[PDB]
Symmetry: C2
Subunit: 96 residues, 2 copies
């Protein structure tokens, strides 16, 4: 499994996850990349992304993670860890 | 019906079509953008 870095400012969504559809040479054919969406089992609906217009060209994530990393103990670190974890989650979740 | 001016030197696809998701307040709900693609009738095939 790879990891998507966000410490460096993001110019746009990463290629692997925003590219419309792939073209496989095994069938020499196009097919839609699953990374957009997936049908949630027996629910009648599918997921949906929604980018936020302030996810780009900011050092907010960088400085926040630095001031979370500065700490020494562990319990204090945990709370800022969770905060920044849910941060970009909520940012990219959108109205969906 | 509108028209798309491709005579303009383009940078990205227009936002009317490329994005496959829009949120409308009529039902305060999200819905996939139909302009993304439409399946061909009674063949189980989706364009791209």
């Amino acid at each position: 499994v790879p990891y998507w870095d966000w410490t460096q400012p993001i110019r746009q969504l990463p290629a692997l996850i925003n590219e419309a559809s792939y073209f496989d040479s095994r069938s020499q054919t196009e097919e839609s990349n699953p990374f957009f969406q997936v049908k949630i089992l027996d629910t009648g609906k599918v997921t949906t992304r929604d980018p936020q217009p302030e996810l780009f060209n900011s050092d907010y994530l960088l400085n926040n993670v630095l001031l979370a990393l500065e700490q020494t103990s562990f319990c204090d670190f945990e709370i800022q860890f969770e905060i920044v974890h849910n941060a970009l989650h909520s940012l990219v979740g959108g109205r969906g």
